[PDB]
Amino acid sequence: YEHSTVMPNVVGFPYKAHIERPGYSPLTLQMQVVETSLEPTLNLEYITCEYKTVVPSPYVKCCGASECSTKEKPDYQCKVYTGVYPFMWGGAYCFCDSENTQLSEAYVDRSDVCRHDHASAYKAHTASLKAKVRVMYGNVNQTVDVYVNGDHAVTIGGTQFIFGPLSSAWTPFDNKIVVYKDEVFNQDFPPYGSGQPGRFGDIQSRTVESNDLYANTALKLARPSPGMVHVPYTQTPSGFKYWLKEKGTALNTKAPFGCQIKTNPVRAMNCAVGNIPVSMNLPDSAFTRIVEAPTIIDLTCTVATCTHSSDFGGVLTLTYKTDKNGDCSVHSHSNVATLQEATAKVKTAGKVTLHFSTASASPSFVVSLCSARATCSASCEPPKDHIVPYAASHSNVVFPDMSGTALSWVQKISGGLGAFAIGAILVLVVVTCIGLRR
Amino acid sequence: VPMAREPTVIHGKREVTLHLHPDHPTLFSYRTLGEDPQYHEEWVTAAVERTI
Ligand SMILES: *[C@@H]1O[C@H](CO)[C@@H](O[C@@H]2O[C@H](CO)[C@@H](O[C@@H]3O[C@H](CO)[C@@H](O)[C@H](O)[C@@H]3O)[C@H](O)[C@H]2NC(C)=O)[C@H](O)[C@H]1NC(C)=O
Ligand SMILES: *[C@@H]1O[C@H](CO)[C@@H](O[C@@H]2O[C@H](CO)[C@@H](O[C@@H]3O[C@H](CO)[C@@H](O)[C@H](O)[C@@H]3O)[C@H](O)[C@H]2NC(C)=O)[C@H](O)[C@H]1NC(C)=O
């Protein structure tokens, strides 16, 4: 017997579904969302890490001259100087007084620990949702893991379940992402091959083990001071170290809808938004024949106390008359009130109790015990505790019933005004008819 | 790593007054888990009093 329904995508919400087969007693299922995971698809762009300057020893060729030779190294810099007269601890070598030259060399290279501490630049699109749902009905417990899209069917005790695609298509990740350890940043990084010195991405590598490297750190050489051998140079500080100190905020403390961001793999968990359609297919063994279920007649509903609080702050009493004792399915047909139990013990005494939670001043709903029906109305007073540490267990519906006190007063005043207007209309019509008949 | 003491909460009408007692610079941050959150983060150094 195929069935369909929609359930809120709120973790821990006690959703209950009612199935009414016309040849069998009604059945009630319970579905609860334990855990979700929004999984985006990532494309790696480049990898950034702290750089390291390699400066070989100078080659002081003296009583001669040297010529610079080009090389294919990242950000290579080389120059030749004339007129150096170096000194060492034991004295000064290079006999030639002024006909000496020194060749300076330097370039940039990826650091030694780049493969343990680096930042990744990604492109994120087309998130995929995954969830873990707990279902119970009759005597069947169990939790399952399901991809939330209309193309995964899971069987739980002979029943086929298909969880449809999410109603909304909202993702907390922007188009471009920078990932560092366990933090996700919504950042717009410079393109590969166009990095600027001193900022994020001054040196870039296509992959952590890739041989190619593009480095732009404005390495510049300077003439050595007289009588020393030191190869001076100047260079703009590393951009990765700068980014570490002024990245600013994150996405873990910035994401909406109160969902935690985790890494490896990048995902957003327990992130309440939208609705999850559910498609079901149940066998005949789950239902019960109508002859076996007890017959319930003369069902009346009364309310003892009501306080529209987050927890179950309502007590309900049902009176009935039955022939035998067994088990019924208890359901509420309106979302203004949510019942705590899905099954109740029916007995020849004729009194059962239930618990419900509401968020409206004057709720009104219809409750069914097996096949009987009854209508409940209540007057609920506000609670006294200002703040509680647990989520709401109701559907957050505030509009009162048309039979409530405020709506009753509105009805009375409107009826009085309408009666006055109707009397006005009648008098005017009578006068006009008398005038016309003359 | 040490764990800082639990702050003292004072309930109000859709508002919480929060007492903070640090021994050394700790990071304090909060956010509202609605449709449009309201961010904050800070480096608390001495005893303070914040309303959230
Ligand atoms: C031992 O010390 C003597 C010091 O005199 C070195 O002689 C020097 O040798 C260089 C190499 O040829 C000379 O440089 C040349 O200078 C002329 C211009 O004078 C230039 O046209 C050449 O192209 C070349 O650059 C240098 O002049 C010469 N010193 C003097 C005072 O003339 C000698 O080389 C040293 N021995 C060794 C093995 O290094
Ligand atoms: C279906 O299976 C789940 C998981 O086994 C059942 O939930 C479990 O219910 C028991 C009580 O019946 C929980 O034990 C108690 O948990 C409280 C939590 O504060 C603890 O303080 C107690 O000392 C005791 O251990 C158990 O924690 C709970 N499991 C989980 C994961 O929440 C569930 O009841 C089963 N379905 C039905 C209809 O019974």
- CB-based contact B33 A258, cutoff 8 Å: yes
Would you call A315 exposed, middle or buried from its count of C-beta atoms within 10 A (0-12, 13-18, 19+)?
middle
Distance set, CA A13 to CA A129, A137, A144, A275, A366 (Å): 18, 16, 17, 12, 21
Q: Which atom of ligand 1 is nearest to the CA of A63?
A: 10
Identify whether the C-beta of residue A153 lies closer than 8 Å to the C-beta of residue A161: yes
Nearest CA to ligand 1 atom 19: A99
Experimental method: cryo-EM
Go through chain B and tell me how many residues it has. 52
Reduce the DSSP state of residue A132 to 3 states and report it: strand
Q: Using a 6 Å CB cutoff, which residues line ligand 2?
A: A 136, 141
Distance set, CA A223 to CA A233, A236, B29 (Å): 9, 18, 51
Measured in angstroms, the resolution is: 3.5
Reduce the DSSP state of residue A437 to 3 states and report it: helix
| Choice from A133, A135, A141 to test ligand 2 binding pocket (greatest atom count within 8 A of CB) | A141
Reduce the DSSP state of residue B17 to 3 states and report it: strand
Chain A residue with Cα closest to B36: A256
What's the per-residue H, E or C state across A300-329?
Answer: EEEEEEEECCCCCCEEEEEEEEECCCEEEE
What is the distance in angstroms between the Cα of A182 and the nearest Cα belonging to chain B? Answer: 17
- DSSP string for A397-432: --PPPTTSHHHHHHHHHHHHHHHHHHHHHHHHHHHH
Distance set, CA A319 to CA A293, A300, A348, A350, A352 (Å): 18, 5, 11, 5, 7
Distance CA A308, CA A360 (A): 6
DSSP at A24: B
Residue A97: CB within 6 Å of ligand 1?
no
Chain A residue with Cα closest to B28: A253
Identify whether the C-beta of residue A277 lies closer than 8 Å to the C-beta of residue A6: yes
- Give distance in angstroms: CA of A143 to centre of ligand 2: 13
Region of residue A366 (left: phi > 0; alpha: psi -120 to 50; beta: else): beta
Identify whether the C-beta of residue A290 lies closer than 8 Å to the C-beta of residue A25: yes
B13 has a chain A CB within 8 A of its CB: yes
Distance CA A107, CA A407 (A): 82
Distance CA A334, CA A400 (A): 13
Nearest CA to ligand 1 atom 22: A64
Residue A96: name the closest of A63, A126, A127 by CA: A63
Token code pair at residue A139 = 């005597």
Query: From the CB of residue A31, how many other CB atoms can be counted at a distance below 10 Å?
Result: 21
Reduce the DSSP state of residue A46 to 3 states and report it: strand
Chain A residue with Cα closest to B33: A258
DSSP at A394: S
Breaks (C-N over 2.5 A) in chain B follow: none
Residue recorded with tokens 């047909």: A333
Query: From the CB of residue A400, how many other CB atoms can be counted at a distance below 10 Å?
Result: 17
Region of residue A49 (left: phi > 0; alpha: psi -120 to 50; beta: else): beta
Residue A165: name the closest of A182, A152, A181 by CA: A152
Query: From the CB of residue A357, how many other CB atoms can be counted at a distance below 10 Å?
Result: 23
- CB-based contact B34 A386, cutoff 8 Å: no
Token code pair at residue A344 = 């109740």
Token code pair at residue A424 = 């006005």
Residue A95: CB within 6 Å of ligand 1?
yes
Distance CA A344, CA A352 (A): 8
Give the one of B11, B29, B31 whose C-beta lies nearest to A386's C-beta: B11
- CB-based contact B29 A254, cutoff 8 Å: no
Residue recorded with tokens 């007692």: B21
Strand partners, A136: A30
B16 has a chain A CB within 8 A of its CB: yes
